[PDB]
Design a protein around this motif. Sequence first.
Motif, PDB file in Angstrom:
ATOM      1  N   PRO B  92       0.535  -4.269   5.906  1.00  0.00           N
ATOM      2  CA  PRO B  92       1.448  -3.337   5.227  1.00  0.00           C
ATOM      3  C   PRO B  92       0.997  -3.014   3.810  1.00  0.00           C
ATOM      4  CG  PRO B  92       2.422  -5.529   5.238  1.00  0.00           C
ATOM      5  CD  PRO B  92       1.096  -5.630   5.995  1.00  0.00           C
ATOM      6  N   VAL B  93      -0.184  -2.413   3.676  1.00  0.00           N
ATOM      7  CA  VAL B  93      -0.739  -2.049   2.353  1.00  0.00           C
ATOM      8  C   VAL B  93      -0.154  -0.699   1.910  1.00  0.00           C
ATOM      9  CG1 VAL B  93      -2.794  -3.489   2.661  1.00  0.00           C
ATOM     10  CG2 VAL B  93      -2.782  -1.097   3.471  1.00  0.00           C
ATOM     11  N   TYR B  94      -0.793  -0.037   0.943  1.00  0.00           N
ATOM     12  CA  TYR B  94      -0.326   1.219   0.348  1.00  0.00           C
ATOM     13  C   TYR B  94       0.555   2.139   1.202  1.00  0.00           C
ATOM     14  CZ  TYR B  94      -4.087  -0.240  -2.782  1.00  0.00           C
ATOM     15  OH  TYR B  94      -4.946  -0.948  -3.605  1.00  0.00           O
ATOM     16  N   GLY B  95       0.010   2.739   2.261  1.00  0.00           N
ATOM     17  CA  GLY B  95       0.763   3.702   3.069  1.00  0.00           C
ATOM     18  C   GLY B  95       2.110   3.170   3.517  1.00  0.00           C
ATOM     19  N   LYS B  96       2.140   1.940   4.029  1.00  0.00           N
ATOM     20  CA  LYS B  96       3.406   1.381   4.525  1.00  0.00           C
ATOM     21  C   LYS B  96       4.405   1.215   3.388  1.00  0.00           C
ATOM     22  CE  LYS B  96       6.589  -1.073   6.955  1.00  0.00           C
ATOM     23  NZ  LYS B  96       6.345  -2.590   6.612  1.00  0.00           N
ATOM     24  N   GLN B  97       3.952   0.721   2.220  1.00  0.00           N
ATOM     25  CA  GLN B  97       4.887   0.564   1.119  1.00  0.00           C
ATOM     26  C   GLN B  97       5.337   1.901   0.556  1.00  0.00           C
ATOM     27  OE1 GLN B  97       6.249  -2.252   0.979  1.00  0.00           O
ATOM     28  NE2 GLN B  97       4.676  -3.264   2.247  1.00  0.00           N
ATOM     29  N   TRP B  98       4.432   2.882   0.463  1.00  0.00           N
ATOM     30  CA  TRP B  98       4.801   4.201  -0.069  1.00  0.00           C
ATOM     31  C   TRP B  98       5.863   4.893   0.785  1.00  0.00           C
ATOM     32  CZ3 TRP B  98       0.211   7.749  -1.897  1.00  0.00           C
ATOM     33  CH2 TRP B  98      -0.533   7.069  -2.913  1.00  0.00           C
ATOM     34  N   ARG B  99       5.698   4.811   2.101  1.00  0.00           N
ATOM     35  CA  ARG B  99       6.532   5.592   3.010  1.00  0.00           C
ATOM     36  C   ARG B  99       7.668   4.802   3.667  1.00  0.00           C
ATOM     37  NH1 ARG B  99       5.108  10.047   5.110  1.00  0.00           N
ATOM     38  NH2 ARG B  99       7.434  10.222   5.114  1.00  0.00           N
ATOM     39  N   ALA B 100       7.540   3.494   3.663  1.00  0.00           N
ATOM     40  CA  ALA B 100       8.463   2.659   4.467  1.00  0.00           C
ATOM     41  C   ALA B 100       8.599   1.217   3.952  1.00  0.00           C
ATOM     42  CB  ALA B 100       8.030   2.698   5.985  1.00  0.00           C
ATOM     43  N   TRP B 101       8.933   1.082   2.675  1.00  0.00           N
ATOM     44  CA  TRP B 101       9.136  -0.245   2.076  1.00  0.00           C
ATOM     45  C   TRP B 101      10.293  -0.909   2.795  1.00  0.00           C
ATOM     46  CZ3 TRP B 101       7.494  -2.427  -2.971  1.00  0.00           C
ATOM     47  CH2 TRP B 101       8.216  -3.563  -3.341  1.00  0.00           C
ATOM     48  N   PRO B 102      10.064  -2.071   3.442  1.00  0.00           N
ATOM     49  CA  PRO B 102      11.140  -2.748   4.152  1.00  0.00           C
ATOM     50  C   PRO B 102      12.113  -3.443   3.198  1.00  0.00           C
ATOM     51  CG  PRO B 102       9.163  -4.070   4.254  1.00  0.00           C
ATOM     52  CD  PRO B 102       8.780  -2.787   3.582  1.00  0.00           C
ATOM     53  N   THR B 103      13.397  -3.229   3.393  1.00  0.00           N
ATOM     54  CA  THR B 103      14.383  -3.921   2.590  1.00  0.00           C
ATOM     55  C   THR B 103      14.735  -5.235   3.306  1.00  0.00           C
ATOM     56  OG1 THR B 103      16.390  -3.051   3.605  1.00  0.00           O
ATOM     57  CG2 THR B 103      15.227  -1.650   2.035  1.00  0.00           C
ATOM     58  N   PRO B 104      15.344  -6.204   2.594  1.00  0.00           N
ATOM     59  CA  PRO B 104      15.644  -7.465   3.284  1.00  0.00           C
ATOM     60  C   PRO B 104      16.659  -7.306   4.434  1.00  0.00           C
ATOM     61  CG  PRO B 104      15.852  -7.700   0.874  1.00  0.00           C
ATOM     62  CD  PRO B 104      15.758  -6.227   1.177  1.00  0.00           C
ATOM     63  N   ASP B 105      17.440  -6.227   4.418  1.00  0.00           N
ATOM     64  CA  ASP B 105      18.486  -5.987   5.414  1.00  0.00           C
ATOM     65  C   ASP B 105      18.155  -4.889   6.433  1.00  0.00           C
ATOM     66  OD1 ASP B 105      18.825  -3.794   3.541  1.00  0.00           O
ATOM     67  OD2 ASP B 105      20.893  -3.577   4.281  1.00  0.00           O
ATOM     68  N   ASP B 110      11.595   5.327   1.747  1.00  0.00           N
ATOM     69  CA  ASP B 110      10.462   6.225   1.649  1.00  0.00           C
ATOM     70  C   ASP B 110      10.332   6.551   0.162  1.00  0.00           C
ATOM     71  OD1 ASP B 110       8.632   8.335   1.590  1.00  0.00           O
ATOM     72  OD2 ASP B 110       9.345   9.182   3.485  1.00  0.00           O
ATOM     73  N   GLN B 111       9.446   5.841  -0.518  1.00  0.00           N
ATOM     74  CA  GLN B 111       9.339   6.030  -1.968  1.00  0.00           C
ATOM     75  C   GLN B 111       8.824   7.392  -2.329  1.00  0.00           C
ATOM     76  OE1 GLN B 111       8.296   2.454  -4.391  1.00  0.00           O
ATOM     77  NE2 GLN B 111       7.280   1.872  -2.473  1.00  0.00           N
ATOM     78  N   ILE B 112       8.058   7.976  -1.414  1.00  0.00           N
ATOM     79  CA  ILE B 112       7.459   9.264  -1.713  1.00  0.00           C
ATOM     80  C   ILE B 112       8.485  10.379  -1.708  1.00  0.00           C
ATOM     81  CG2 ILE B 112       5.741  11.019  -1.126  1.00  0.00           C
ATOM     82  CD1 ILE B 112       4.643   8.287  -2.357  1.00  0.00           C
ATOM     83  N   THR B 113       9.324  10.439  -0.663  1.00  0.00           N
ATOM     84  CA  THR B 113      10.369  11.434  -0.633  1.00  0.00           C
ATOM     85  C   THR B 113      11.419  11.173  -1.715  1.00  0.00           C
ATOM     86  OG1 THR B 113      11.694  10.392   1.139  1.00  0.00           O
ATOM     87  CG2 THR B 113      10.036  11.967   1.788  1.00  0.00           C
ATOM     88  N   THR B 114      11.624   9.904  -2.091  1.00  0.00           N
ATOM     89  CA  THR B 114      12.498   9.562  -3.222  1.00  0.00           C
ATOM     90  C   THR B 114      11.961  10.208  -4.497  1.00  0.00           C
ATOM     91  OG1 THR B 114      13.278   7.483  -2.275  1.00  0.00           O
ATOM     92  CG2 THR B 114      13.351   7.677  -4.712  1.00  0.00           C
ATOM     93  N   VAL B 115      10.679   9.997  -4.801  1.00  0.00           N
ATOM     94  CA  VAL B 115      10.074  10.547  -6.023  1.00  0.00           C
ATOM     95  C   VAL B 115      10.111  12.076  -6.029  1.00  0.00           C
ATOM     96  CG1 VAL B 115       7.712  10.981  -6.919  1.00  0.00           C
ATOM     97  CG2 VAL B 115       8.680   8.613  -6.837  1.00  0.00           C
ATOM     98  N   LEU B 116       9.781  12.687  -4.893  1.00  0.00           N
ATOM     99  CA  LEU B 116       9.901  14.132  -4.740  1.00  0.00           C
ATOM    100  C   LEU B 116      11.313  14.601  -5.093  1.00  0.00           C
ATOM    101  CD1 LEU B 116       8.071  16.537  -3.438  1.00  0.00           C
ATOM    102  CD2 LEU B 116       9.805  16.380  -1.543  1.00  0.00           C
ATOM    103  N   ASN B 117      12.311  13.927  -4.528  1.00  0.00           N
ATOM    104  CA  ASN B 117      13.686  14.301  -4.778  1.00  0.00           C
ATOM    105  C   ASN B 117      14.021  14.146  -6.268  1.00  0.00           C
ATOM    106  OD1 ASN B 117      16.930  13.095  -4.107  1.00  0.00           O
ATOM    107  ND2 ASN B 117      16.229  15.201  -3.746  1.00  0.00           N
ATOM    108  N   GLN B 118      13.450  13.136  -6.901  1.00  0.00           N
ATOM    109  CA  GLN B 118      13.709  12.900  -8.309  1.00  0.00           C
ATOM    110  C   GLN B 118      13.051  13.943  -9.164  1.00  0.00           C
ATOM    111  OE1 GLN B 118      12.401   8.722  -8.104  1.00  0.00           O
ATOM    112  NE2 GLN B 118      14.097   8.292  -9.479  1.00  0.00           N
ATOM    113  N   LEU B 119      11.811  14.275  -8.857  1.00  0.00           N
ATOM    114  CA  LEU B 119      11.105  15.264  -9.661  1.00  0.00           C
ATOM    115  C   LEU B 119      11.758  16.626  -9.589  1.00  0.00           C
ATOM    116  CD1 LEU B 119       7.468  14.196  -8.908  1.00  0.00           C
ATOM    117  CD2 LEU B 119       8.777  13.998 -11.109  1.00  0.00           C
ATOM    118  N   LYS B 120      12.336  16.947  -8.416  1.00  0.00           N
ATOM    119  CA  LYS B 120      12.990  18.237  -8.200  1.00  0.00           C
ATOM    120  C   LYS B 120      14.412  18.252  -8.766  1.00  0.00           C
ATOM    121  CE  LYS B 120      10.722  19.546  -3.854  1.00  0.00           C
ATOM    122  NZ  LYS B 120      11.019  19.441  -2.380  1.00  0.00           N
ATOM    123  N   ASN B 121      15.161  17.189  -8.540  1.00  0.00           N
ATOM    124  CA  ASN B 121      16.603  17.228  -8.807  1.00  0.00           C
ATOM    125  C   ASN B 121      17.073  16.358  -9.963  1.00  0.00           C
ATOM    126  OD1 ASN B 121      17.234  19.127  -6.691  1.00  0.00           O
ATOM    127  ND2 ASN B 121      16.618  17.527  -5.276  1.00  0.00           N
TER     128      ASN B 121
END
Lengths: 262, 262
Positions: B92-105, B110-121
Amino acid sequence: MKQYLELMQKVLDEGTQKNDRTGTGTLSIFGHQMRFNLQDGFPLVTTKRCHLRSIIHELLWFLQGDTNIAYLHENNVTIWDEWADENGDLGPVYGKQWRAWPTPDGRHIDQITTVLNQLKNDPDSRRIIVSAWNVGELDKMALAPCHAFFQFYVADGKLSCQLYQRSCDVFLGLPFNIASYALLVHMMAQQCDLEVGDFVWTGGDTHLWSNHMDQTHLQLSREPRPLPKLIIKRKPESIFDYRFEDFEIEGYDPHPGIKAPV
Amino acid sequence: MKQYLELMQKVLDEGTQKNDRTGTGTLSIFGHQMRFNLQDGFPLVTTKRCHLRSIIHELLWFLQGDTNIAYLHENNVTIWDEWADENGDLGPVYGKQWRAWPTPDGRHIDQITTVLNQLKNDPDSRRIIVSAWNVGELDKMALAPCHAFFQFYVADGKLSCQLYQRSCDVFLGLPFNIASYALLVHMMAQQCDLEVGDFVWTGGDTHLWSNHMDQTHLQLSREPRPLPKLIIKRKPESIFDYRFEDFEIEGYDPHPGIKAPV
């Protein structure tokens, strides 16, 4: 400190005016780096009087993995009061991540013990890192970490540490953050029989609140004094066994304190 | 580039001997920062011929959330071959963490779509951050992330990004890593209708392998050329829909490539 005042000047020189959710406004710059040689002296801002008392307690609290403010209260440390919930809880902030980062499969990683083991056994490692930036638990924290992660390094018997600070209040927050991490390096160095090297501070969104400008111009008018000496009076059996009274600072001779508003 | 060659010379001047896993030795410094104003040009090293080919594929691959090297093989990119297991997996290197960071629960962020949403909104957010440093999954990864954490920032309609790189092979890795993140900024900027701002490169253990000395000196003997310009020849409808052929470099007239052993 010279480097600290240089950053202050930089935010004045090239900062962009921004808004914050609060509607107060900031001057902000992005990306900065400073290096403090800890053998030069303990890096506690001299161009206004700062106090180590809360810094030391907060660090000891972090190291215990505590995220309830009860301990801070025992010692009249009120720096986290506005962020805590009714039970005194902050959620899984700094200390919890440092000491018991939850894995997706129900385990806990003690990053502090990990880093000690690395500094002792694998001092050349390029991955001696503590991160508070637990993406999967951010929405559980009172506040997302500002001092987000840090990396240690060993060369020629000296321990260095670099902090990435994703958001920095230059006037109020940074003098506190710098001394906090410098203290940690000293403790880590002592526990690993290393000399103290450099504390490298790296900033992301680095700002001055618009209501701190008056204070900033005053402080910028002042010439830094020489740095004091940190004394640790005892060598505890572990990184988790330091006590407030183990630390003394000698020769601290600052310009008067400068009170901010809130 | 001027800053890149300055860094090489800094490592020669200040670097200390620090051994390693393989026993080749490095000259190493700790803590460095460079700023590339992307408005000035695309920061592709000109003092040796560099090529975007593997850089682009790796970045498209990260953006897909892929940690299996099959995509890279399909595209004749070999840079990860020594690290992948028999199945082509890196864990679970770069790609997995960028797109699908597992939470404990049991969720995935998806950090990438999060950042996109932040940069836009929410472009003034002070936590527009992507972390690969998932402490809880390091034990599953072929290697711990080197380009571990990055943060975006928006001022005056311009997008900046700061990378934290815990370990940097200056001669071989660094030109690649700079162009990689510069490309990512241009892509994010295009997708958010922002102008490109600065790319800030921040390093932890920043070293020259001792068997890169002759190469380093050759390169240092050469005068940097004007920066090239990145041409994106098509605007995809999402940050995930770039194609290798979308990117072209213009005005790139490097000195000859310099081959260096791994």
